[PDB]
Design a protein around this ligand. Structure first.
Ligand SMILES: Nc1nc2c(ncn2[C@H]2C[C@H](O)[C@@H](COP(=O)(O)NP(=O)(O)OP(=O)(O)O)O2)c(=O)[nH]1
Ligand SMILES: [Mg+2]
Ligand SMILES: [Mg+2]
Length: 430
DNA sequence: AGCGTCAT
DNA sequence: ATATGACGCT
């Protein structure tokens, strides 16, 4: 109808770095560039656990969450770089810093929401209308979109990938209505021109390549980004949604990869996101509750209102280490020594944070997991964080958990601890 | 406040 | 065989 909202009011992009930790190591070590390559943590455990994989190594089937020794069976020439270890744990300082390089450049173009160490959303609505003016009324050249895919195109009456790409892009452009400054597709198109520039800026100034999605909301931008990785960007228009969603498994939409998505599948008897359109909102609200119901009713139509939040910094600063199986911490002396390792790294990072971003954390959260409980957090207690001091912070963290020790013995800890997690939260401006 | 979900 | 971050529910 004429009163029904189509969710075309915003231009939103998600930019995600291609195999980010590997790129960071490849920039540093030229010997690793353009090779099957992976980043692991903890060498002595089956060669280390893989957390990032180059696309050359992906083509042998190497994946995240693989042990390196297993990965070598698939890929014997697989090169590896290992994560820095400090105080007996993984230290991610180099990637956090690399992330700041990327985030800052993105910030010159628009207000961003940092979504992970590697990706950010971008509300390009204002930048689009500003460019749209000063473009007078000139058409948009395909030269301006040299890595952009139009989802759903080409269609209708080349055998190579770049061949298909341009044909899709030509079809799209040749249909475009530059007469109308207020057309959503035009908005998206100009949004995509800006992301080309932004992505060019990131690579020119950091050496890092990335992919992006351009659409009208965060969920479509995120999904779009993944459609043509690596080193490419994808425009998912409102019109492209019904065909796209008609074979799109539900688990692929953001926040639907867990238990909620499974229950949508199980309770409703469906597989694809598009199948959700045949249910009334009240029906959906009835099954998955009021909030999820509303969200699903609109999302299966390509409509989502979640705003890009202005927030380039993390809201919490955290430290954890798992103590699996037999390395579980079973003495009081062990627990105190590790809380101190954690407290020391956290102090280092909080002091940095205070000087960089003019703020202080005020609350400390202590998380632990106990042997046998598969709940990845068994218990969570908190205290005041009044000083950036490792010894006090570990002493406090111990105070608030020490009563979990069921061991009648003075010097023993039971049940043995399989995770320690320290988290600084509740920031105030300093 | 403490716990559960989803995710990179 | 084996590290963090955002946010929702009660
Ligand atoms: N320590 C740790 N780091 C992780 C884990 N999972 C991901 N990371 C880190 C390592 C990742 O590099 C980084 C970004 O996560 P993605 O974007 O989902 N994977 P990438 O960027 O490598 O490839 P592409 O995006 O092109 O598919 O987060 C984990 O379980 N543990
Ligand atoms: Mg990435
Ligand atoms: Mg990412």
């Amino acid at each position: 109808g004429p009163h029904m909202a189509t969710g075309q009011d915003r231009v939103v992009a998600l930019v995600d770095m291609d195999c980010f930790f590997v790129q960071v190591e490849q920039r540093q070590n030229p010997h690793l560039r353009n090779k099957p390559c992976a980043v692991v943590q903890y060498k002595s455990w089956k060669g280390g656990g893989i957390i990032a994989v180059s696309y050359e190594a992906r083509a042998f089937g190497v994946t995240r969450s693989m042990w390196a020794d297993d990965a070598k069976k698939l890929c014997p020439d697989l090169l590896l770089a290992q994560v820095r270890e400090s105080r007996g744990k993984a230290n991610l300082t180099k990637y956090r810093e690399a992330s700041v390089e990327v985030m800052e450049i993105m910030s010159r173009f628009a207000v961003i929401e940092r979504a992970s160490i590697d990706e950010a959303y971008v509300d390009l609505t204002s930048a689009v209308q500003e460019r749209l003016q000063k473009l007078q009324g000139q058409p948009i050249s395909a030269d301006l979109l040299p890595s952009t895919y139009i989802e759903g195109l080409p269609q209708g009456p080349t055998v190579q990938k770049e061949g298909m790409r341009k044909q899709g892009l030509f079809q799209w452009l040749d249909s475009l209505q530059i007469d109308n400054l207020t057309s959503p597709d035009l908005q998206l198109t100009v949004g995509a021109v800006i992301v080309e520039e932004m992505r060019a800026a990131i690579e020119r100034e950091t050496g890092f390549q990335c992919s992006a999605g351009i659409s009208h909301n965060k969920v479509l931008a995120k999904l779009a980004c993944g459609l043509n990785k690596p080193n490419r960007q994808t425009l998912v228009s409102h019109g492209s949604v019904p065909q796209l969603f008609s074979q799109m498994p539900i688990r692929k939409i953001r926040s639907l990869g867990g238990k909620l998505g499974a229950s949508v599948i199980e309770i409703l008897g469906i597989e694809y996101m598009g199948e959700l359109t045949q249910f009334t909102e009240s029906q959906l609200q009835s099954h998955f509750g009021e909030k999820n119901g509303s969200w699903l009713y609109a999302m299966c139509r390509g409509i989502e209102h979640d705003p890009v939040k202005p927030r380039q910094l993390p809201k919490t600063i955290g430290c954890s280490k798992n103590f699996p199986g037999k390395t579980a911490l079973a003495t009081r002396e062990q627990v105190q020594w590790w809380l101190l390792q954690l407290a020391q790294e956290l102090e280092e990072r909080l002091t940095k944070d205070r000087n960089d971003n003019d703020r202080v954390a005020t609350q400390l959260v202590v998380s632990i997991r106990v042997q046998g409980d598969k709940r990845l957090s068994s218990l969570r207690r908190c205290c005041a964080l009044t000083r950036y001091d490792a010894h006090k912070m570990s002493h406090d963290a111990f105070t608030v958990i020490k009563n979990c020790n069921t061991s009648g013995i003075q010097t023993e800890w039971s049940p043995p601890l399989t995770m320690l997690f320290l988290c600084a939260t509740k920031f105030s401006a300093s």
